[PDB]
């Protein structure tokens, strides 16, 4: 049989795909539960549980016909029940009742849903999801959304069987394979914390013909043994291996695999640094006095200070820590929205953002937002902005240097080198009499509970954070909404809570940012809409409330996977996250073989995208 063997690095807090917005959950559930639609190898949206669909002429009513052979299975593979339209009613009501962390995807879109969530109504029958019959689910929206179908690839719109959900109660969706039912390509055979994730092909899945591996086995990787990836690939145990050009082992690796190193493309997941604008927790700090803590609290609210950090942060040096000197720039990402995420009359989003920067000050003159280069690092500009910040901050009694805590996992050797790089860059440019980056090396549990898995803003224990966003649907709002003060998914990472904007949020202008988002969202013409979102992205770059850093992809690997066999998606959870479509082979792929396959894929993608646009018109009814 055919097996894929590699590693994983993030244990999930749960399998609750209806309540979670973390990739630690959806990366797993992508393989276990299907929704209405999915992706092909080219990023087109194709049938999944829904074999057909229509949209009304006014754009408000979407109706999906579910295929009759789709079933729910237990973790052991036994059939539980057919998938029915009611399962989509159940899923949305459960997501609403549980206050899902991904509710922003649906709460302002589905008719009646906001009223139900906020208690203006108590009757879910007034909410715009209905099972018209066992095979037909109908959604009613508040306003047209050309990106609505792309939202169905997000797990909050996935179904759940109501009887199973009732039987499980509070046990539903725990980190245990028996806590959910399965209707997707795989069953989960093992889920062991800090050890293993194992998938087994479900032979009775409706689309089993498109599952080309029988088993997927992932061993836990904590970052302490980066050479283990190539070592186990060469030993024949892993199907692929990410390469680390800084290793002492790399010279021998590049000689042995001179014709096999493959670089991936940068993808739509964007990372950035942000500041904690309202820090409450100080378990992990080098500050020892209230004056230091209050000084840092003031500094992060100062725009000139944030801009000075931005201009002092050498992204090339940062990327070199993981990619080596020659690949250092291959991972660089300079906006939250990828520069090619959308186009406006033939011009990419990033070029439009650059043109909007003309109105945000001389410090942005000539900026270029293309991937793969560093347009931010500029020591002279950083020093000048810092001088302005220092005058403003000293007048408030702020003490210098400003100490900024950044966390990192003690086992994450490459991550330690990355954070050491930012410390060296910022302190070298601005002076350690002005800024100190204090690196806090934490255990796994401490790192989790003070960051990604912290449950409130008050538990965020750092001054600087380095997280990222993967897009949920095909519109710039998926990225730019994450900082809005009403419901932004990234607010807690900034130390803020969704709701009324507090004095810290207003001090940095996030109330104004939120009003801008509301106005842009009303625009229905794509070109005008995207231009308004480009101005919003420009505002955010200027605010330096985010410091764009890197993307996923752009990295070297060795591979025994078949090039371009897997699903690909610009947004959602049904692309690279899924082991459906993926194929393995005996031969180690060569760089030349991969390049030939890539050119074929690029060409076919354009052809297939054009066909997919023509297929769309047939669905208007």
């Amino acid at each position: 049989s055919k097996t894929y063997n590699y590693v994983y690095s993030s244990d999930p807090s749960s399998l609750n795909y209806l309540a979670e917005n973390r990739a630690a959950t959806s990366d797993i559930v992508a393989n276990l539960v299907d929704g209405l639609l999915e992706n092909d190898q080219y990023g087109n949206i194709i049938p999944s549980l829904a074999e057909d669909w229509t949209v009304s002429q006014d754009g408000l009513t979407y109706t999906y016909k579910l295929r009759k052979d789709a079933k729910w299975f237990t973790s052991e593979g036994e059939e539980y029940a057919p998938v029915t339209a009611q399962d989509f009613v159940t899923g949305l009501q459960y997501a609403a009742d549980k206050k899902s962390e991904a509710l922003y995807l649906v709460q302002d879109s589905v008719a009646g849903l906001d009223d139900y969530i906020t208690g203006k109504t108590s009757d879910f029958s007034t909410v715009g999801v209905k099972a018209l019959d066992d095979q037909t689910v109908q959604y009613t929206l508040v306003k047209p959304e050309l990106y609505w179908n792309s939202k169905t690839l997000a797990t909050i719109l996935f179904p759940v069987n109501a009887d199973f959900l009732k039987s499980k109660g509070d046990d539903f969706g725990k980190a245990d394979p028996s806590s959910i039912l399965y209707n997707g390509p795989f069953l989960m055979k093992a889920l062991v914390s800090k050890s293993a994730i194992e998938y087994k092909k479900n032979p009775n899945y409706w689309d089993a013909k498109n599952v080309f591996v029988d088993d997927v086995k992932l061993t836990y990787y904590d970052g302490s043994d980066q050479e283990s990836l190539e070592r186990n690939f060469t030993a024949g145990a892993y199907t692929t291996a990410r390469l680390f050009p800084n290793s002492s082992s790399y010279e021998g690796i590049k000689e042995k695999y001179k014709n096999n190193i493959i670089y991936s493309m940068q993808n739509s997941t964007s990372y950035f640094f942000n500041f904690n604008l309202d820090r409450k927790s100080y378990n992990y700090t080098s500050k020892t006095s209230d004056i230091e803590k209050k000084s840092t609290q003031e500094a992060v609210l100062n725009k000139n200070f944030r801009q000075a950090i931005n201009f002092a942060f050498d992204r090339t040096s940062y990327g070199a820590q993981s990619e080596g000197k020659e690949g250092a720039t291959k991972i660089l990402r300079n906006l939250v929205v990828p520069p090619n995420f959308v186009s406006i009359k033939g011009k990419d989003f990033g070029e439009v953002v650059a043109s909007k920067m003309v109105n945000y000050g001389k410090e942005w003159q000539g900026i270029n937002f293309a991937d793969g280069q560093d347009p931010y690092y500029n020591p002279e500009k950083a020093k000048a902005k810092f001088a302005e910040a220092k005058k403003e901050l000293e007048a408030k009694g702020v003490q210098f240097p400003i100490h900024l805590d950044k966390t990192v996992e003690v086992t994450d050797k490459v991550g330690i080198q990355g954070v050491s790089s930012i410390k060296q860059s910022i302190e070298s440019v601005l002076g350690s009499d002005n800024v100190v980056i204090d690196i806090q090396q934490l255990t796994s549990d401490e790192f989790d509970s003070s960051g990604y898995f912290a449950q409130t803003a008050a538990q965020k224990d750092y001054d600087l954070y380095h997280g990222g966003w993967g897009p949920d649907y095909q519109d710039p709002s998926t990225y730019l909404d994450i900082f809005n003060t009403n419901s932004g998914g990234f607010l807690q990472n900034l130390g803020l809570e969704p709701g009324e904007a507090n004095d810290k949020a207003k001090a940095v202008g996030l109330d104004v940012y939120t009003q801008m988002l509301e106005e842009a969202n009303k625009e229905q013409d794509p070109a005008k809409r995207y231009e308004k979102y480009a101005d919003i992205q420009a505002w955010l770059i200027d605010s330096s409330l985010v410091l764009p850093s890197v993307s996923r992809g752009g990295t070297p690997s060795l591979r025994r996977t078949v090039p371009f066999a897997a699903a690909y998606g610009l947004t959602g959870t049904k692309g690279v996250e899924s082991y459906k479509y993926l194929k393995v082979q005996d031969k180690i792929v060569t760089t030349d073989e991969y390049a030939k396959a890539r050119e074929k894929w690029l060409k076919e993608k354009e052809e297939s995208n054009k066909k997919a646009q023509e297929e769309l018109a047939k669905h208007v009814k």
Binding site: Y6, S9, A23, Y452, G468, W469, P471, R552
Partner: peptide, 10 residues
């Protein structure tokens, strides 16, 4: 979706 990393994945 909220992401961590980046680390060695697919």
């Amino acid at each position: 979706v909220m992401v961590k990393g980046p680390g060695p994945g697919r």
